[PDB]
Design a binder for this molecule. Structure first.
Ligand SMILES: COC(=O)c1ccc([C@H]2C(C(C)=O)=C(O)C(=O)N2CCc2c(C)[nH]c3ccccc23)cc1
Ligand SMILES: *[C@@H]1O[C@H](CO)[C@@H](O[C@@H]2O[C@H](CO)[C@@H](O)[C@H](O)[C@H]2NC(C)=O)[C@H](O)[C@H]1NC(C)=O
Ligand SMILES: *[C@@H]1O[C@H](CO)[C@@H](O[C@@H]2O[C@H](CO)[C@@H](O)[C@H](O)[C@H]2NC(C)=O)[C@H](O)[C@H]1NC(C)=O
Ligand SMILES: CC(=O)N[C@@H]1[C@@H](O)[C@H](O)[C@@H](CO)O[C@H]1O
Ligand SMILES: CC(=O)N[C@@H]1[C@@H](O)[C@H](O)[C@@H](CO)O[C@H]1O
Ligand SMILES: *[C@@H]1O[C@H](CO)[C@@H](O)[C@H](O)[C@H]1NC(C)=O
Ligand SMILES: *[C@@H]1O[C@H](CO)[C@@H](O)[C@H](O)[C@H]1NC(C)=O
Lengths: 501, 655, 119
């Protein structure tokens, strides 16, 4: 016997009619005796009265709580209730599925959601994939931010890459009265990557003010945790196009699927104890006695409710009331304003749908071209096991798209370039403050037009397929009429090497 | 206007004091510009009904605040939770007249909550001030597993790391435990003897029983506890002379009520002149909304000060802590407590009689009861530490010298005498030479006894991080000091920044650099034959050493280091022989080691001179109480000329 | 001390001293602001740049380095021992008698005793 407590939704007829008979979820290895509970506009009195009545009336062996998003202080009431009654709870929902670090000692909550540490680790994994090594941090004065401010630094320490950070800023943004100091603070910070921490009722202010100080163009890129964007169904306006976030698995699942998963995990734990042939422990009495002074041999049940998996999905719940080592996906906002999957995190290896970030749509982030010339630029193979090439060496995925009319995609193997011209490029990137991405060219060596059409490096620059071009490139009057050159940095000419002496 | 505030108490008598206080505060401002009311409820044995009653209290009026106090119940933890959570839904500010648990400061969990009495965590500041006064640097921290203990430890560690000093040893026992002699035994075997306690009363009594059984409560020790550990059954049996501390006038429950009403009135007067008169929530049902100006009211209430409070000037911390409450130092003068001094959290002013300590002495105890049996670890280095086998009689053969006095020797144990293949074997040997004579002089100068031994690996010691981990532990001899294997290092240990991060050295006693040895074009590190790899010349060093770090500490030399990563020796004079056998082209290493052997044996030359100069120094654990005297002995040796006489003896008797 | 600490009067160009120099005063109320340049002064500039602190530099009046005429310590050692300063940088060697009352950092220039003769 379990209970279902719908907290808020649109038209409720669907699930209410679906909760008729225990033929739904007729795959749990036990006899299911479901009972449904409806709840109007939510408040502590309503929740307390409803669940106390249900407990006193039905001998309920467990509860599931599905709630509306954007509510802030609901889960704690559930924790206090579960502590006072010692009957378990489980909230498979949007609002109350946000982790609380300290809980009451005797409760049993079993929240389904991840903390800031795991999300930050995944965010840094995706950040390190694309060479991105500089970023700024902007955090609102939303409470529980020191935890994030220190988890960022701890995780950044944990990794091997240098992780050279520019600045951290603490804003105070709310209703539009005190909205001037944050403007100046946001005005004078520059970076290629931003990691921000704010709530959904505050991103609409942060991004709105950011779009006024030139921080939303394709040059910059944003990353925010799952605390924001609460309404994943219909994203709002004024959000940047293409911001990266991380969401646990089953972000596309249906509400019926969610309640099915909840009843399945509860019944799986119950039948897992039943295979032990011990008992089916009864809940506590009621609310009017304030009972349950100590923890009886019932303490096994809660424990046995942890490891149990289902349908090939690891559901290991930590002693902290949140699930450990799940599968989580990365999402972003395409040029349609609807989220799309990018890459899973199964068993701790990052998959990515895009080998190169699209940068869809003054500016920054200009593209460059180069080809092997033996001292100037050297192309080699990546690490034997890692793939992240040697420090002081630039990843350079060559474009081998020799055919696209009847060819799907050429696998862009991640090579890494190093040398002299690349060193000059590094110095230029540090000094004039831009961003780049090398890609070798595969149409001729340097360039010699075959009756009106150029090729190679100069060809790429002329047809506007690349903003710059660096390497072993000579100055003449033949091609200096078509592109624009820099003041020379290497002296060269023509020479005649002879055999010997 | 009619401004309404609420409160919850349990006296039914001090509620009259609450209404008297609110009326008297209304006498301060009563022109009807604002007008004050007062409501109250009582506590109940059941929690759910308590929350529902606070709900109905809230609906009763258009309430602006809540005041909650501790009833005669003995469950002091959860008592203010049902009022805080419920009102926390609507962001109604509340105040705590008396509660000390350190969970109500987590502002992400109790959304709106204030206080007028400092929590149990703030005592760490007083302990830090007392430590700064009495100058006890080596401290031991004994704490529990419940959230309060972790919070107190975190605050104390924040202070200590702010001064970059750290703690000698931290060890915790899970709550509700008995017969735990193991942890006190683990804490007994260190030089630091001051121990800092924080736990419940019953756990305090159990710790007292165990410690009294373990003799660890007598003379030579000083341990100071908080306030929760000298009350109730814990106070019954305890060693004499335990320092403590008590609140200024806490648990009055009626002194704080006047201050609470005064600050509430002062805040509401400033609030009402604002444009946003949202008007507090009315109703405990249907209203699934929040108060439109709750955060603003909390912000103005936090930053509103008071002029003359019965308990002193009232300000609030970043989370609502009492912000400069007084504190009274205590003692145990033969089964009766006493006041010894008053500290205001910023400084301690002793304004009472003399303080007795557990041993009955009157002079101030000092920590770090200095041991007299010290271990010593060293390495095999030719000019400095010679290793030899001993005879069958039990003593290595005597060896006189041209001076007319014998060479000092000692017995060094530890190795297998065969590094490559040895299942398990430790053998005794003899050690002598330069550093051994220096140790002889040091020991005879500062009254101590030594038991030398050798390392277990043979490498000098270099920090590294093994795979599949985030922590990096030092390897070899350098590790042996940190983990607790040894107490001192008398060996040619160079002084680099990375070493200086975690250990601390004495003054240098021999200066040197790095140089090159060659068998009789080779020159300094500028040639393309060296900067670039070629088979004509091959260079190498000793693995897991300082030079490895020095060549991995430079991006612009990467390729060269890579060359060194190809093949190098984990070796000794064996490398000198590898050079001798024409296998290796040149050697790069410390100045003295090479200069001794080059002029000593034959046919070998040192290339050029030094390029990177550094010294040799003794190694000691962080902030150990011996370093000052060791340095004062080393400088005296340098000034005497003894290191001069010693120098000729061992290095100038060549060529 | 010429190799390490050099004092130069400010030039009549623009009142302020030439860059890469620091304003220093030889105290004794009236003052004339010289400026000091040298080796230990460069070390001090780097230290101020790395340890994130601020300083003011003033020369000494009494005996050069240090002595003990029955507890009356003059010089920089005296100025530090009587709590009128917090550091003392320059040509200041290390020996047992000094380190008893004044602390010391690690050395950065190694010296000793030496004999100069006629060639
Ligand atoms: C997407 O971002 C990047 O990939 C990226 C770009 C540049 C750099 C490095 C650069 C090197 C070694 O390449 C540094 O030495 C350096 O100074 N960088 C940028 C510094 C920088 C500032 C101060 N402001 C910026 C604004 C935009 C872009 C960069 C900056 C690092 C990473
Ligand atoms: C799941 O974890 C529990 C521990 O919480 C495992 O061990 C059970 O622990 C209880 C303690 O009361 C024992 O009495 C049981 O005997 C233990 N196991 C069993 C089933 O006998 C449990 O084994 C774990 N299950 C899995 C999936 O390995
Ligand atoms: C001012 O406070 C008094 C009491 O603090 C309020 O009177 C109470 O009203 C409730 C209504 O549910 C009754 O149950 C109590 O018995 C009343 N107590 C007393 C002493 O009369 C009064 O309502 C408050 N003022 C306003 C305007 O609400
Ligand atoms: C010595 C002294 O004045 N310090 C405190 C004072 O700040 C405080 O106000 C008073 C009680 O209020 O106790 C004392
Ligand atoms: C027993 C012991 O270690 N106490 C020592 C003693 O042996 C030594 O002789 C004295 C100085 O002479 O200092 C003290
Ligand atoms: C509380 O404080 C008042 C005012 O200082 C004082 O008179 C009284 O003795 C204290 N104790 C009690 C129990 O009221
Ligand atoms: C250090 O030496 C002094 C005398 O020079 C002596 O009084 C003191 O006890 C010594 N300290 C230690 C810890 O040995």
């Amino acid at each position: 016997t379990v209970a279902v407590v719908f907290s808020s939704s649109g038209p409720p007829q669907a699930q209410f009619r679906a909760r008729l008979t225990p033929q739904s979820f007729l795959d749990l290895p036990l006899e299911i005796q479901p009972l449904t509970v409806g709840v109007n506009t939510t408040n502590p009195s309503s929740l307390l009265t409803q669940i106390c009545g249900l407990l006193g009336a039905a001998h309920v062996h467990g509860i599931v709580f599905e709630d509306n998003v954007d509510t802030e202080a609901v889960a704690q009431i559930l924790d206090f209730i579960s502590s006072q009654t010692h009957v378990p709870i489980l909230s498979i929902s949007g609002g109350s599925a946000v982790v609380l670090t300290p809980k009451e000692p005797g409760s049993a909550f079993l929240q389904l959601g991840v903390s800031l540490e795991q999300q930050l680790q995944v965010l840094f994994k995706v950040l390190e994939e694309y060479d991105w090594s500089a970023f700024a941090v902007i955090t609102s004065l939303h409470p529980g931010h020191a935890l994030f401010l220190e988890g960022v630094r701890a995780v950044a320490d944990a990794s091997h890459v240098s992780w050279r950070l520019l600045d951290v800023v603490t804003l105070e943004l709310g209703p539009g009265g005190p909205r001037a100091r944050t403007q100046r603070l946001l005005r004078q910070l520059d970076a290629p990557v931003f990691v921000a921490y704010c709530s959904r009722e505050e991103a609409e202010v942060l991004f709105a003010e950011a779009a006024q100080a030139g921080l939303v163009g394709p040059g910059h890129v944003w990353l925010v945790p799952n605390l924001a964007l609460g309404s994943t169904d219909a994203p709002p306006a004024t959000f940047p196009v293409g911001l990266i976030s991380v969401v646990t698995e089953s972000w596309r699942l249906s509400l019926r699927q969610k309640v099915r998963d909840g009843v399945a995990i509860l019944a799986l734990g119950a039948h897992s104890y039943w295979r032990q042939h011990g008992t089916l422990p009864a809940p506590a009495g009621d609310c009017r006695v304030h009972p349950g002074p100590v923890s009886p041999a019932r303490e096994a049940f809660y424990r046995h409710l942890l490891n149990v998996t289902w349908e090939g999905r690891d559901f290991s719940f930590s002693p902290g009331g949140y699930l450990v080592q799940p599968t989580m996906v990365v999402i972003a906002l395409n040029r349609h304003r609807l989220w799309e999957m990018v890459g899973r995190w199964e068993h701790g290896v990052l998959y990515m749908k895009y080998p190169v970030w699209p940068r869809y749509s003054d500016s920054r982030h200009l593209t460059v071209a180069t080809l092997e010339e033996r001292p100037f630029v050297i192309v080699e193979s990546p690490d034997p096991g890692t793939g992240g090439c040697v420090p002081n060496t630039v990843p350079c995925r060559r474009q081998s798209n020799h055919t696209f009319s009847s060819g799907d995609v050429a696998p862009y193997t991640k090579l890494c370039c190093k040398g002299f011209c690349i060193d000059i490029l590094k110095k230029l990137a540090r000094v004039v403050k831009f961003s780049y991405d090398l890609y070798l060219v595969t149409n001729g060596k340097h360039g010699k037009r075959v009756r009106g059409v150029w090729n190679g490096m100069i060809g790429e620059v002329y047809y506007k397929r690349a903003d710059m071009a660096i390497g072993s490139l000579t100055i003449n009057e033949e091609r200096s009429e078509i592109v624009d050159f820099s003041v020379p940095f290497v002296e060269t000419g023509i020479s005649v090497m002879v055999a010997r002496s | 206007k009619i401004v309404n505030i609420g409160a919850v108490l349990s006296t039914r008598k001090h509620e009259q004091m609450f209404r008297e206080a609110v009326n008297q505060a209304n006498k301060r401002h009563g022109s009807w510009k604002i007008q004050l009311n007062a409501t109250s409820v009582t506590h109940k044995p059941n929690a759910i009904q308590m929350a529902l009653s606070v709900c109905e209290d809230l609906i009763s009026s258009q309430v602006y605040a809540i005041l909650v106090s501790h009833p005669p119940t003995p469950n002091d933890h959860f008592t203010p939770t049902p009022v805080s959570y419920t009102a926390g839904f609507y962001r109604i500010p509340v105040l705590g007249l008396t509660t000390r648990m350190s969970i109500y400061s987590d502002k992400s969990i109790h959304l709106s909550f204030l206080r007028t009495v400092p929590p149990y965590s703030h005592q760490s500041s007083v302990w830090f001030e007392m430590m700064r006064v009495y100058s006890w640097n080596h401290i031991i921290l004994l704490v529990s597993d419940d959230h309060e203990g972790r919070a107190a430890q975190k605050r104390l560690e924040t202070l200590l790391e702010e001064r970059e000093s750290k703690a000698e040893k931290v060890l915790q026992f899970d709550p509700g435990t008995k017969n735990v002699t193991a942890l006190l035994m683990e804490a007994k075997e260190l030089e630091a003897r001051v121990i800092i306690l924080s736990a419940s009363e019953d756990d305090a009594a159990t710790v007292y029983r165990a410690a009294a059984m373990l003799n660890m409560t007598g003379s030579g020790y000083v341990w100071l506890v908080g306030e929760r550990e000298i009350s109730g059954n814990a106070l019954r049996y305890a060693p004499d002379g335990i320092l403590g501390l008590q609140l200024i006038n806490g648990k009055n429950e009626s002194a704080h009520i006047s201050d609470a009403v005064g600050v509430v009135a002062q805040a509401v007067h400033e609030l009402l002149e604002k444009e946003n008169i949202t008007d507090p929530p009315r109703g405990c049902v249907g209203n699934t909304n929040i108060w439109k100006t709750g955060p603003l009211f909390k912000r103005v209430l936090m930053s509103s000060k008071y002029a003359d409070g019965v308990t002193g000037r009232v300000e609030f911390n970043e989370d609502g802590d009492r912000k400069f409450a007084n504190y009274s130092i205590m003692n145990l003068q033969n089964r009766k407590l006493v006041q010894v001094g008053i500290y205001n959290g910023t400084h301690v002013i002793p304004n009472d009689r003399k303080i007795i300590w557990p041993g009955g002495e009157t002079e101030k105890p000092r920590g770090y009861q200095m041991s007299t049996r010290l271990k010593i670890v060293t390495i095999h280095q030719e000019p400095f530490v010679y290793v030899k086998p001993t005879l069958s009689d039990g003593t290595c053969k005597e060896e006189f010298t041209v001076n007319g006095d014998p060479v000092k020797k000692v017995i060094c144990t530890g190795p297998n005498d065969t590094s490559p293949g040895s299942p398990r074997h430790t053998v005794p040997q003899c050690c002598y030479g330069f550093c051994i004579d220096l140790l002889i002089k040091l020991a005879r100068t500062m009254n101590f006894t030594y038991e030398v031994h050798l390392v277990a690996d043979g490498k000098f010691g270099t920090q590294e991080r093994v795979n599949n981990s985030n922590k990096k532990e030092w390897n070899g001899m350098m590790g042996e000091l940190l983990s607790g294997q040894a107490d001192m290092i008398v060996a040619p240990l160079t002084i680099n920044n990375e070493r200086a991060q975690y250990i601390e050295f004495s003054k240098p006693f021999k200066y040197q650099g790095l140089t090159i040895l060659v068998k009789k074009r080779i020159t300094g590190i500028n040639d393309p034959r060296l900067r670039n790899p070629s088979d004509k010349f091959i260079y190498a060093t000793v693995k897991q050493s300082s030079v490895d770090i020095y060549f991995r500490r430079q991006v612009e030399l990467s390729t060269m280091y890579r060359h060194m990563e190809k093949h190098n020796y984990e070796s000794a004079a064996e490398a000198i022989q590898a050079v001798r056998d024409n296998k290796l082209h040149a050697f790069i290493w410390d100045s003295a080691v090479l200069e001794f052997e080059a002029s000593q044996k034959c046919d070998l030359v040192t290339t050029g001179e030094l390029f990177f100069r550094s010294g040799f120094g003794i190694g000691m654990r962080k902030d150990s109480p011996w370093k000052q005297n060791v340095s004062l002995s080393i400088l005296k040796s340098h000034e005497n000329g003894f290191m001069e006489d010693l120098d000729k003896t061992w290095v100038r008797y060549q060529e």
